[PDB]
């Protein structure tokens, strides 16, 4: 067995292809050797070494022992790999890093940092007598007995969470102690506060060890709730302040609304008022607030200015994951465009403090941001999309664009830029002038058959590379790459028309606009691009572009996408390079209103090109004086607030809109041009009415020697080939208390037979990225999972896959890692937390209910509605239960009205048993509030079943034995309620 592996290792000890044999021999019980080698893109020798070592390793692993397997992994794991710099411990930041003038004697007092650390204080004196390294003095901050608690990132409302912790005792002698928990209102605990924070049960830790801590809680309210933990011992008392983040059920969905304020109509029609209506979505999670933030900034560029200058974060594309070098460049995009605005227009007086220090800070952040991509650069100065992956023509072009633009304000290394440009033009430019891609990275999915898709992608890549080379040409103005630019420009000129898509037409037009703008064929391309223009209004208030050609698709989109903003941005930049000022104003208005709170847009490319369009337009037109009285108020409610926007302050902080009324933003006569964006965040219970561009399936299995298997497959659009999607993302939300095996994920990306190109675990999410998801078959990620802490009433999680550059091509699906049913009953006590906030059905035919308590409960000012219904249908949707009922007799209506004998919907949390309703039976139901939805073309009302919702079974006949009297008093109350009007 050793010699059978000694031969293998000895064969590939100094082999050119050595890694392929190594990760060929790795265990993969889900795919054959040929299926794994089918993904190898490093040549035939790597495929043959991989296949050999894979087959031999699979034959040797038959009927093995654990010691034999581990010894084999010892033989392979040492001789073939090299090494990797990594550290298992973290070191806190140093401090006291200061210089002092010491007149022979100087004392300075401070506070030691909060840490268990042996600090080492080192002094170095400098004087006219030389240098003196003082004796290093030690300062050990140490705690012998201390508690720590492990609080999860988030917890879904209703889940019963076990909070685990540990008390540490480093003293050699054991001791008594007790930890107690701080009871907050929203957090429901099984026990009850004594005097108000839990109880002290004295336990003992043994000397030089630890003791476990557990606290079961059940959050009833959404939001961040403070929880304290007290550790008490005969030697003191410690308080640990903590925070539990409670998240609603269902999926988060985010909609955006944009409005441009032009009070004097300088760039278009006058715009002084706008009304953002309050509309409740269809599948809204019950007892959850509709969140919406209001952001009113000063200029077209004000949102990006606020994003960079307000350092509370921040990424303008947080919904897209890191991993690709594109993300590292996008991190420096906003700082660059802000700096370009402030420097080119000389607007440093916006700062109330010293402008020179602010220009310093921005220059430093710009340099630091520009360094982020250096990891993805290879020795030959090419760039790779994935760290350690193959060099990409596309990404090298993009890096040349960002670097070439940044070089204006932070000078770049000319020799490096030269080597990158020459790597492009010397290797991956064909005779016809086009550029070809080296790697398998597919940034975009285009239409047409395989040949037509090839032509389209070739045109797109050539234009993209041309943009990159043009943006960085002045750094390294070589005659060779100018000749390359000429050949590529010729290819674009000859091959753009006839167009196959507005997207490639636009990017080709913008690439050619960076060169000779007098060529006739370029003018023809600009004409063809103008022919595809869409307008809102006549005379047009808006002008934008759809990425599909008109002769292929005549329908007009109702909401924007990334391709829409990117095509419109390319057309806008082409027009700006042509100085076509009459044509861009409605385009600028459309891109400005399509912008998002934070400054970004839908994906990365549309974001950078739209930011360049807005900024370049802002620098090209006259800067108007800014003076508005902006008042935001609710329609049928109080005035929210108002502020006077001037050039002094115009990046004001956002404001949360809490009330459920329609919002109204208005201004009087003003000077300037402000932007008003509203971001709405809701949580929905369903995803059925969303267009799915992927077939999804996900399951949990038991394995031999629990595991999640998540499969996706691409659904090609119209005229799209079966080649598969472009750069894709598989985001798997993990349920509460479920932890993923990171080794399984590493094994799927680190090898030459990689299935995925990058992975990460962020905030309870397993985020994988991919070059392409197939259309022909399913692709599955498989990774083991384990239970970190115990969770009861586990809320389902989500499985989302989408195209990185087309987040609109997506599909979201719910799943649960627990099979757990049934939900029959909660049995007595240890129960008040589950049944805390939901309704309890009255006792069946209970005659002790005294008709006046049935009226006083109905006439309660808290109780909004109260009437008698008949249930028609039961339905179970995800985490909730919906009851279709008929509204029979109305007894009270405080807020909106519903019609008699109309269909009324009820909703209760599925995790509520004592409110079990039987289909076909009548019930008297009284409660608070409702939801008014617009379904089809009419209204609909949905009523949640919570606490203080009085429900009672109501038979229609009178053969219920003694319930003849029951219905007697029931109809007594029912008769008395409407004849009085309390």
């Amino acid at each position: 067995l050793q010699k059978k592996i000694e031969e293998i290792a000895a064969k590939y000890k100094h082999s050119v292809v050595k890694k392929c044999c190594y990760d060929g021999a790795c265990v993969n019980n889900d795919e054959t050797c040929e299926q794994r080698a089918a993904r190898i893109s490093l040549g035939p020798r790597c495929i043959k070494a991989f296949t050999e070592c894979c087959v031999v390793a699979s034959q040797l692993r038959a009927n093995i022992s654990h010691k034999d397997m581990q010894l084999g992994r010892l033989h392979m794991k040492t001789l073939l790999p090299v090494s990797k710099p990594e550290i298992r411990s973290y070191f806190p930041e140093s401090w006291l890093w200061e210089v002092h003038l010491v007149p022979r004697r100087k004392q300075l007092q401070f506070a030691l940092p909060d840490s268990l650390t042996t600090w080492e204080i080192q002094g170095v004196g400098i004087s006219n007598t030389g240098i003196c390294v003082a004796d290093t003095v030690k300062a050990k901050v140490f705690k012998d007995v201390f508690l720590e608690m492990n609080i999860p990132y988030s917890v879904v409302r209703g889940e019963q969470i076990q909070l685990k912790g540990t008390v540490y005792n480093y003293r050699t002698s054991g001791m008594q102690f007790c930890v107690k928990m701080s009871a907050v209102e929203g957090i429901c605990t099984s026990e009850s506060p004594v005097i108000k924070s839990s109880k002290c049960v004295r336990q003992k830790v043994e000397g030089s060890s630890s003791h476990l801590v557990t606290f079961t809680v059940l959050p009833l309210e959404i939001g961040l709730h403070n929880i304290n933990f007290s550790l008490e011992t005969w030697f003191g008392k410690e308080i640990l302040v903590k925070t539990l983040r409670v998240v609603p059920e269902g999926v988060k969905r985010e909609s955006y609304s944009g409005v441009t304020l032009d009070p004097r109509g300088i760039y278009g029609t006058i715009s002084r008022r706008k009304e953002f209506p309050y509309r409740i979505p269809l599948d809204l999670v019950p007892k959850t607030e509709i969140k919406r933030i209001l952001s009113v900034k000063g200029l077209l560029v004000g949102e990006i200015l606020s994003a960079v200058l307000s350092q509370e974060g921040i990424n303008i594309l947080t919904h897209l994951p890191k991993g690709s070098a594109e993300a590292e460049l996008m991190s420096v995009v906003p700082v660059f465009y802000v700096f370009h605005y402030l420097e080119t227009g000389n607007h440093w007086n916006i700062f109330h403090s010293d402008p020179l220090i602010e220009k310093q800070k921005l220059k430093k952040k710009l340099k630091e941001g520009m360094l982020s991509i250096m990891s993805y650069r290879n020795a030959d100065y090419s760039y790779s999309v994935w760290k350690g992956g193959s060099a990409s023509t596309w990404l090298t072009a993009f890096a040349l664009r960002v670097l070439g633009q940044v070089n204006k304000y932070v000078e770049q290394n000319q020799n490096s830029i030269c080597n990158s440009l020459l790597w492009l033009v010397e290797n991956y430019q064909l005779d016809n002038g086009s550029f070809k891609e080296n790697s398998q990275y597919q940034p975009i999915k285009l239409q047409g058959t395989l040949p037509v898709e090839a032509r389209e992608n070739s045109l797109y890549l050539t234009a993209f590379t041309v943009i990159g080379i043009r943006k960085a040409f002045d750094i390294c103005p070589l005659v060779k790459i100018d000749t390359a630019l000429i050949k590529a420009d010729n290819f674009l000129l000859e091959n753009t028309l006839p167009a196959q898509s507005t997207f490639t037409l636009a990017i080709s037009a913008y690439a050619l606009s960076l060169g000779d703008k007098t060529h006739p064929q370029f003018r023809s391309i600009v004409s063809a691009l103008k022919r595809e223009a869409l307008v809102k209004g006549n005379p047009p208030i808006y002008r934008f572009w759809k990425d599909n050609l008109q002769h292929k698709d005549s329908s007009v989109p109702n909401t924007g996408t990334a391709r829409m903003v990117e095509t419109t941005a390319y057309a806008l930049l082409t027009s700006l390079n042509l100085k076509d000022i009459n044509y861009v104003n409605p385009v600028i208005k459309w891109l400005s209103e399509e912008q998002r709170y934070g400054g970004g847009f839908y994906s990365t490319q549309d974001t950078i090109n739209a930011i360049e369009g807005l900024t370049e337009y802002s620098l090209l037109v006259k800067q108007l004086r800014l003076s508005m009285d902006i008042d935001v108020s609710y329609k049928h409610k109080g005035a929210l607030h108002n502020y006077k926007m001037t050039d002094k302050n115009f990046l004001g902080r956002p404001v949360e809109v809490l009330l459920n009324d329609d919002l109204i933003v208005s201004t009087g006569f003003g000077s300037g041009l402000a932007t008003v964006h509203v971001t709405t965040v809701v949580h929905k219970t369903s995803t059925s009415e969303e267009v799915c561009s992927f077939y999804l399936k996900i399951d949990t299995q038991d394995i031999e020697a629990k595991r999640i298997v998540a499969c996706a497959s691409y659904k090609p659009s119209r005229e799209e080939s079966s080649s598969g999607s472009s750069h894709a993302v598989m985001d798997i939300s993990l349920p509460t208390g479920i932890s993923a095996n990171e080794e399984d994920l590493k094994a799927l990306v680190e090898g030459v037979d990689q299935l995925f190109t990058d992975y990460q675990i962020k905030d309870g999410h397993v985020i994988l990225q991919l070059n392409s998801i197939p259309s022909s078959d399913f692709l599955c990620v498989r990774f083991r999972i384990f239970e970190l802490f115990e969770v009861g009433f586990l809320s389902p999680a989500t499985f989302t896959v989408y195209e990185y550059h087309r987040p609109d091509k997506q599909c979201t699906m719910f799943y649960s890692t627990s099979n757990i049913k049934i939900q029959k009953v909660c049995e007595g006590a240890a129960c008040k937390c589950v049944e805390a906030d939901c309704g309890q059905m009255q006792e069946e035919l209970d005659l002790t209910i005294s008709a006046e308590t049935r009226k006083q409960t109905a006439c309660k000012p808290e109780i909004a509605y109260a009437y008698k219904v008949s249930i028609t249908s039961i339905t179970v949707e995800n985490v909730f239960v919906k009851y279709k009922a008929t509204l029979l007799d109305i007894y009270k209506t405080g807020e909106a009205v519903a019609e008699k004998d109309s269909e009324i919907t009820f909703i209760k949390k599925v995790t509520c048993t004592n409110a079990e309703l039987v289909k076909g039976r009548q019930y008297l139901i009284m409660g608070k509030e409702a939801l008014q939805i617009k379904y089809n073309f009419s209204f609909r009302y949905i009523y949640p079943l919570d606490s203080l919702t009085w429900i009672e079974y109501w038979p229609r006949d009178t053969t219920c034995s003694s319930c003849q009297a029951f219905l007697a008093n029931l109809d007594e109350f029912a008769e008395d309620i409407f004849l009085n009007g309390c």
Binding site: E6, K67, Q70, L71, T78, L79, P85, E86, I87, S89, F91, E93, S94, L96, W97, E98, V99, L101, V102, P103, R104, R105, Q107, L108, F110, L112, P113, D114, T117, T118, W119, I121, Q122, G123, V124, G125, I126, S127, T129, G130, I131, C132, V133, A134, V137, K140, V141, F142, T166, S208, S209, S210, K322, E328, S372, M374, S375, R377, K387, S416
Partner: protein, 647 residues
């Protein structure tokens, strides 16, 4: 017969205040002399010059400080390599070609930590001194080179106080992992460089902690058959790992700097981690019979690399640990000479002070040492001396010897060994040495030695040196002459009266702060008459206590063995004189470093413990060039400074 001696550093240092000594003899009437550094070879330009007066009031000895200004030298294509040292007077005019260096000062790069993780910021400052160990106040350029060889950042800053604070270097979110280099340099005039390193490593969450404890830090002859290794492992919640699988692989390593190692697939022994602790024994002999080696005579100064993998049984998680190398040690002792020049003076007893250290370079006491020696005279007639034996002084670690050789001896090949009662003959320490006789055409020799060197010289005390000449022409020597050098600069010089009523006479030298941390003393007398004047010289190296000129001391009030988190504490800084102080507070765990006093005495152009094959070699080994009308026969191509020899 009238003579003149011009003493200068072996090499001129651009921008340095170079002190030039002139000592003339035989002159009774006063006269002036001009010392000058001019351009080579035309002497059209005078880089600097000074006038010195020589009189009976002056004892016909004087000094002049010259400076080659950096701005006075061209830049770029055809830079200056040589200058002319020139002395002109009514009596004589002599010049010499002197090489120059553009290395001036010291640049110490100080980063807060040596290891960083992504998104951290590297705090970095530079301590900048000129050649005279004073705040350079020169603008400085910092360069950052990543593990892939790319220069990713450069920043220059002016220097006001000798401490240069630079902006923090932000490590990227996804950086290049590995060894980063920081390079400090002066923007103008000089070629001085500084260099520091810091690693950027990727953080990986560990499941548990694994510790390896070898029986000893070195492997001797007693543990060459069995070497105990204890492998412990515990969870980070302060509990011992109950059951796990321990796999241990062993390798042979050349040096710890190179990450190359030769594994041994024969000693892959596997054991069980039970209740936190496991133990194995490594039979070195049997395992190193693999990969050749075979014997313990080999493997000496090589290392034993140890690799351990621990696989916890409950959760199946695995964690690794490694010992980089345990040096195989053939002899528990290492020998080195102390304050014994390898040069013989015919007629003077030759002393040999051997020194014994352990594997930690610590002075081992009570160690017997045996000294053997062979002698070769002018007739090539070899003679084997009778062996001698001393015991290591336990007060200073010294084992002293004194040797009486015939006057005609020329070469002394002496060998020293340790004589431990419990060591085999192979495991003893052995060192060989060769000493050559000083050559003089007048059979004239000089030997200096200052009472004795234990303890080391403390600033403020006094150095009572003994000057013993052996020669004809003894009772016609008028005086003795001396030059004291420190840190590559002549700090003192002078002349003492020779007593006609003795063979030796004590010359007293007050040891001053200028002599920290080391100095060199050259003493010579002039033999005159017919033929040509002769300089008879000797030199010694003075190791002096490392004492700061402006001593810094930091203390923490209150003083306690341990502190509590968030505790308000006061730090007291005390200096001898008004001084700047750069402070740092670093988690010591980063170290698992720098010593300035040793890197500072690279500017000493002398080598060895003193002495020389002849007068010119004595001056050369002391870091001196000289101009003389006396005999100046030196070796060939002797223009660069000496290089300290290694063995």
């Amino acid at each position: 017969e009238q003579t003149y001696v011009i003493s200068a550093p072996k090499i001129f240092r651009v921008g340095a205040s170079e002190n030039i000594v002139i000592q003339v003899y035989g002159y009774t009437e006063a006269f002036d002399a001009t010392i000058s550094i001019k351009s080579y070879p035309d002497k059209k330009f005078s880089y600097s010059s000074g006038h010195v007066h020589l009189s009976s009031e002056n004892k016909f000895q004087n000094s002049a400080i010259l400076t080659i200004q950096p701005k006075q030298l061209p830049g770029g294509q055809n830079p200056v390599s040589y200058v002319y040292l020139e002395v002109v007077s009514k009596h004589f005019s002599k010049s010499k070609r002197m090489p120059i260096t553009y290395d001036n000062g010291f640049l110490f790069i100080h980063t807060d930590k040596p290891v960083y993780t992504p998104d951290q910021s590297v705090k970095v400052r530079v301590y900048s001194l000129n050649d005279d160990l004073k705040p350079a106040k020169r603008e400085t350029v910092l360069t950052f080179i990543d593990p892939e060889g790319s220069e990713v950042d450069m920043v220059e800053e002016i220097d006001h106080i000798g401490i240069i604070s630079f902006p923090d270097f932000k490590i990227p979110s996804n950086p290049r992992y590995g060894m980063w280099t920081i390079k400090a340099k002066y923007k103008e005039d000089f070629s001085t460089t500084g260099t520091a390193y810091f690693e950027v490593k990727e953080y990986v969450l560990p499941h548990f902690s694994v510790s390896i404890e070898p029986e000893y830090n070195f492997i001797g002859y007693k543990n060459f058959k069995n070497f105990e290794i204890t492998i412990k492992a515990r969870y980070f919640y302060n509990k011992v790992v109950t059951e796990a699988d321990v796999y241990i692989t062993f390798g042979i390593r050349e040096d710890l700097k190179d990450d190359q190692k030769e594994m041994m697939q024969t000693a892959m022994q596997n054991t069980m981690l039970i209740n936190g602790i496991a133990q194995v024994t490594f039979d070195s002999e049997t395992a190193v019979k693999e990969l050749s080696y075979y014997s313990l005579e080999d493997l000496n100064n090589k290392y034993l690399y140890i690799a351990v993998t621990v696989i916890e049984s409950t959760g199946g998680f695995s964690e690794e640990a490694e010992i980089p190398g345990i040096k195989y040690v053939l002899s528990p002792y290492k020998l080195n000479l102390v304050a014994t020049p390898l040069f013989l003076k015919p007629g003077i007893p030759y002393p040999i002070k051997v020194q014994v250290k352990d594997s930690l370079d610590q002075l081992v006491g009570g160690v017997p040492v045996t000294l053997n020696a062979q002698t070769i005279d002018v007739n090539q007639e070899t003679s084997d001396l009778d062996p001698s034996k001393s015991v290591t002084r336990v007060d200073d670690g010294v084992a002293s010897f004194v040797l009486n050789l015939p006057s005609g001896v020329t070469v002394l090949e002496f060998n020293v060994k340790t004589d431990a009662p419990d060591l085999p003959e192979e495991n003893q320490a052995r060192e060989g040495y060769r000493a050559i006789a000083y050559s003089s055409l007048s059979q004239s020799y000089l030997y200096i030695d200052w009472t004795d060197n234990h303890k080391a010289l403390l600033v403020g005390e006094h150095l009572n040196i003994i000057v013993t000449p052996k020669s004809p022409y003894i009772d016609k020597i008028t005086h003795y002459n001396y030059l004291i050098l420190s840190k590559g600069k002549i700090i003192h010089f002078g002349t003492r009266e020779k007593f006609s009523d003795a063979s030796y006479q004590s010359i007293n030298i007050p040891v001053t702060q200028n002599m920290v941390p080391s100095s060199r003393l050259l003493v010579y007398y002039i033999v005159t008459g017919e033929q040509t004047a002769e300089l008879v010289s000797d030199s010694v190296w003075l190791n002096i206590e490392e004492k700061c000129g402006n001593q810094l001391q930091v203390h923490l009030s209150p003083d306690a063995d341990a502190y509590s988190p968030g505790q308000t504490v006061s730090l007291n800084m005390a200096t001898g004189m008004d001084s700047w102080v750069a402070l740092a507070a670093v988690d010591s765990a980063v170290y698992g470093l720098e010593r300035v006093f040793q890197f500072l005495e690279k500017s000493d152009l002398g080598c060895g413990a003193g002495g020389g094959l002849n007068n010119a070699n004595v001056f050369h080994l002391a870091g001196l060039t000289f101009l003389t009308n006396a005999n100046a026969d030196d070796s060939q191509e002797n223009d660069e400074p000496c290089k300290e020899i290694l063995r």
